[PDB]
Amino acid sequence: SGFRKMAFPSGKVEGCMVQVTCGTTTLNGLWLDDVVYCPRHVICTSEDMLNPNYEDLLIRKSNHNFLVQAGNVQLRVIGHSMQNCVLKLKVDTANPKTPKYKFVRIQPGQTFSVLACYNGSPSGVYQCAMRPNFTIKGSFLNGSCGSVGFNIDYDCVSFCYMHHMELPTGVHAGTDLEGNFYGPFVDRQTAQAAGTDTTITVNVLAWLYAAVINGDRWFLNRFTTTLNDFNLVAMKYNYEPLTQDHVDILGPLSAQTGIAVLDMCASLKELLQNGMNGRTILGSALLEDEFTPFDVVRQCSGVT
Amino acid sequence: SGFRKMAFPSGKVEGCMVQVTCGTTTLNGLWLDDVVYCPRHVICTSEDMLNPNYEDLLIRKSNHNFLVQAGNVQLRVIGHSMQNCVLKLKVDTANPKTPKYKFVRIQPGQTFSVLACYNGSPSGVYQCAMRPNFTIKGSFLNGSCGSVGFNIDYDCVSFCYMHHMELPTGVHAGTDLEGNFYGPFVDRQTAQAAGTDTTITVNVLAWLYAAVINGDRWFLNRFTTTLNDFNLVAMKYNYEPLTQDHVDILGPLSAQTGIAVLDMCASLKELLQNGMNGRTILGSALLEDEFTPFDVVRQCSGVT
Ligand SMILES: CN(C)c1ccc(N(Cc2ccccc2)C(=O)Cn2nnc3ccccc32)cc1
Ligand SMILES: CN(C)c1ccc(N(Cc2ccccc2)C(=O)Cn2nnc3ccccc32)cc1
CATH class of the missing domain: 1.10.1840.10 (main proteinase (3clpro) structure, domain 3)
Known part of the structure; x- marks a missing residue:
């Protein structure tokens, strides 16, 4: 007996977290197979976020400008591509800790566990839900972007969320692992207010x-x-x-x-x-x- | 921003969970170095729990009666000893996933993460606190005994709790990793009621x-x-x-x-x-x- 706000065991996801640095921006990435997924806003400075043209900003970036570090060891970036609001950084090494995984787009009302990370390192795990207004009420600080939401079915992790931003009201917005935002949110620091929760x-x-x-x-x-x-x-x-x-x-x-x-x-x-x-x-x-x-x-x- | 009931990342502890079976009782054990820790009530049947004489019950058990399974592979028990209310099963293989660890006895008001397990397999992770009446309000079903509570300081896991029982009021009681119960609880199915929470x-x-x-x-x-x-x-x-x-x-x-x-x-x-x-x-x-x-x-x- 007893009923707790229980998160999935996070080990499988901890083994996928890496640090991604581009310029002066450092955030988290998810390393599955030989690809590292991260928010495309890693290429931006805080000033760029007001009116970013991601395609244009990305032209000035090359494979060597994406510093990917797994633990204390550097990963070699051999390719990069933008898919919606995420970057896919191809690395020359497949993650040896890659669990069985799926990328799923959840519906509002569905719950998932978030593994909050900073500098590619896990800080904590909590349970949350996709709100009917497509926000999540998480616990994220600056540096937590790229932290992921997931569900586990025995040994297969279904990744459903990646953290991108915090709105002025303290609620959170992000994308699925194909880089599509949940709800109408955009990775632009403009007027974005959530609907009825x-x-x-x-x-x-x-x-x-x-x-x-x-x-x-x-x-x-x-x-x-x-x-x-x-x-x-x-x-x-x-x-x-x-x-x-x-x-x-x-x-x-x-x-x-x-x-x-x-x-x-x-x-x-x-x-x-x-x-x-x-x-x-x-x-x-x-x-x-x-x-x-x-x-x-x-x-x-x-x-x- | 945002403030969640956050548990520690559980990977380090997931790599220590094993299944312990003695007779018809199956529960969880914590495998650190070449020792597996588990509730001494693993030697009991449900009927024994009314008035168990652990020393006497333990005489009828030998190393080969403690079946320890880590994942899908069996561990060889080469020794066993009772320390207060826990059994220490010495195995012939050191856990290769043993993190840096300490055994700590927490005080009431202190919080910890619990990794709820069944059959040596992690089901979920939640945060809880040692109540001032020495109970915990967890989420445990039959089979969850031997699940542990812990805190993490960077890379060192401080184990502070092991689950032993549920009182009639739905609250939980257990021991530290030296087998000493928190509070006045005993591993006997007798009248035990919690003090003021x-x-x-x-x-x-x-x-x-x-x-x-x-x-x-x-x-x-x-x-x-x-x-x-x-x-x-x-x-x-x-x-x-x-x-x-x-x-x-x-x-x-x-x-x-x-x-x-x-x-x-x-x-x-x-x-x-x-x-x-x-x-x-x-x-x-x-x-x-x-x-x-x-x-x-x-x-x-x-x-x-
Ligand atoms: C690329 N860099 C420098 C960057 C700098 C700032 C941000 N923003 C601002 C923002 C809001 C809304 C829409 C577009 C941007 C974030 O909200 C990022 N963020 N995510 N969770 C957070 C929790 C606390 C503090 C910051 C947090 C994103 C990227
Ligand atoms: C050895 N076996 C067969 C055994 C059988 C039963 C128990 N008891 C009974 C009990 C209560 C209080 C004091 C001594 C015993 C437990 O309370 C064990 N337990 N722990 N958390 C639980 C959640 C739901 C259901 C059972 C749970 C322990 C051992």
């Missing part, structure tokens, strides 16, 4: 199921609701609409606890309308939305 | 400093207090007494923000007395106490 309803319900599995049951009420009635209340509280797809995804948790998905919806409806009244659920005083139904099943079954 | 005051203050550093400043008030006045309020709310030692430990965070420690104490006093009023601090609706002042400085400076 709605709550991931299906995730809250999964976490309410985790609460019941782990003994926190005070919020279970005598009521039920419909998808439409629930959604009328959820809209009012800036919660994402709950679909029949989400109900289907919560089927296994509903089966494990014996609580129908719409009954949990009614409990969530009362929590939104009445508040917590100074009570907690799984040690939290708010409704947690950064656990997917899959994460709940995973943690409650002990998948390795 | 008080709040780690110095940790809450450190996290309030992290909030100010990361832009959440709404709770800063026009007041100050004394250690004695603060402690009168803190006692009332089941908060640990704040000492001059704690004030000294918060000195660097006080310097970084320009907020005197006693001014932050007065802000914390108003938060306890008035509540949050439906507001949040660093995405939490309660006062977080599982970040030490050292963790706050570490995360806010990007120590690798």
